[PDB]
Amino acid sequence: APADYFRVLVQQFEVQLQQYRQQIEELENHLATQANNSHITPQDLSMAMQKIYQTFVALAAQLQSIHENVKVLKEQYLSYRKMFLG
């Protein structure tokens, strides 16, 4: 059923959202002050900047395919309308 497929794309999207969210908040705090910045190294930030950019890329992909999916809902909804309502 499409409800099993939908739930999946939705679920993956929600994980990259949570993923990115945590990371960003994490990195915000580390750069919030020099006091908190001293408990980290310039090689940790370098690590985080990667982890974060990787999520961004995956998240941006999920938003993109969500866009394509909505494009498909419209096309098919439009087609049905021409068949049954015109």
Partner: peptide, 16 residues
């Protein structure tokens, strides 16, 4: 970047 994509998606839903 992400907001732009969200934007586009919203236009799609609104245009529907």
């Amino acid at each position: 970047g992400l907001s732009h994509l969200i934007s586009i998606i919203k236009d799609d839903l609104e245009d529907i």
